[PDB]
């Protein structure tokens, strides 16, 4: 059922640690409801941000034409606050208006119909989540719960902010300067005494720093330390 898959999506989103995981969760929900693609869009006055699974070629065209200005979907989304169904079929098929070209292209890219969840945020900001299908009519707007729909939009919104945030590293997890040097010289085949002679770090303390490096990288031996460091691109 739609709400059964929605409850599942909500659990999956909570567990998402990055965008890739959020995309997989949203793709599962979309598939389960009969859709293929999804798109999250956020409009803060002038700037517009999106997180979606629409095809690459369609995205370049969409941005390379500022189709935001003519998408009947966006215009309607701000014109209402309930989950609604839309179809490119209701747009101009003949004539030379910009919507007719928008129609032909959207459909050629599999974005023929869908349902959109619109929500007005703070400061007039606009947010929306759409699920699209290349088919004629796939409409869950009549079964989807209005309140859960908003809950889902809000989680996706906040989840994305809690990612767009800076990297933020933990000092304890990073190799210290003297640790990094002992490891690099070890990877260069230098002994503890030659390393000391080179860095100024005391000889007997060198092996101490290597053991420390191993703990941070979880390596049982120096050769494994080098392999891990190489794989993480640190040496």
């Amino acid at each position: 059922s739609v709400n059964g898959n929605l409850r599942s999506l909500i659990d999956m989103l909570e567990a998402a640690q990055d965008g890739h995981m959020i995309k997989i969760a949203l793709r599962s929900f979309a598939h389960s409801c009969g859709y293929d693609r999804f798109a999250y869009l956020q409009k803060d006055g002038t700037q517009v941000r999106t997180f979606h699974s629409y095809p690459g070629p369609w995205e370049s065209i969409y941005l390379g034409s500022d189709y935001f200005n003519i998408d009947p979907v966006l215009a309607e989304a701000k014109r209402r606050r309930d989950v609604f169904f839309w179809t490119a079929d209701a747009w101009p098929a003949r004539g030379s208006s910009p919507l007719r070209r928008f129609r032909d292209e959207a459909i050629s890219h599999g974005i023929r119909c869908g349902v959109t969840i619109p929500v007005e945020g703070s400061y007039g900001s606009a947010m929306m989540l759409t699920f699209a299908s290349p088919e004629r009519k796939v409409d869950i707007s009549g079964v989807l719960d209005p309140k859960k729909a908003v809950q889902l939009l809000m989680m996706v919104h906040y989840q994305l902010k809690i990612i767009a945030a800076k990297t933020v590293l933990n000092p304890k997890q990073m190799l210290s300067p003297r640790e990094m040097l002992c490891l690099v010289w070890a990877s260069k085949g230098k002994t503890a005494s030659v390393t000391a002679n080179l860095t100024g770090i005391n000889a007997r303390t060198v092996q101490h720093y290597l053991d420390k490096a191993r703990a941070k990288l979880d390596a049982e031996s120096v050769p494994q330390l080098v392999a891990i460091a190489k794989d993480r691109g640190l040496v």
Binding site: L169, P171, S176, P177, R178, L181, V194, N197, L198, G200
Partner: protein, 87 residues
């Protein structure tokens, strides 16, 4: 790439002796910032932006350190030995 091969032993040795001191200088300075960064984060007082500034300085220094150390290793390989440099 291997333009160190066309250098004389005297040129290479001088390059290594000064590259070794530089190596030691960066280490001392980098260790200081890391420890400070270690301390700052260890404090729930210091803000996020003041902790990020220290992280970036760490990421930046680590980068130059890698580049400087790689170069020193190439000089030493072309030289064929490690000159004794006082502390």
């Amino acid at each position: 790439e291997a333009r160190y091969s066309v250098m004389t032993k005297s040129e290479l040795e001088a390059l290594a002796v000064s590259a070794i001191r530089e190596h030691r200088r960066l280490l001392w300075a980098d260790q200081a910032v890391y420890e400070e960064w270690l301390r700052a984060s260890d404090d729930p007082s210091i803000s996020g932006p003041v902790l990020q500034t220290l992280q970036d300085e760490y990421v930046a220094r680590q980068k130059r350190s890698e580049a400087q150390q790689e170069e020193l290793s190439d000089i030493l390989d072309a030289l064929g030995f490690v000159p004794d440099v006082p502390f």
